[PDB]
Amino acid sequence: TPFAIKCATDADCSRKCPGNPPCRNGFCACT
């Protein structure tokens, strides 16, 4: 799914779910 937690960047991924997980299609990879 190129759709998940709405992200800007890695840092933003981190902002929701820490440890700097990656984003793809501007969505954070973390569940």
Swiss-Prot record:
Protein name, UniProt field: Potassium channel toxin alpha-KTx 14.2
Domain of life: Eukaryota
Positions of transmembrane segments: none
Shown segment, full-protein numbering: 24 to 54 of 54
Disulfide pattern: 7-23, 13-28, 17-30
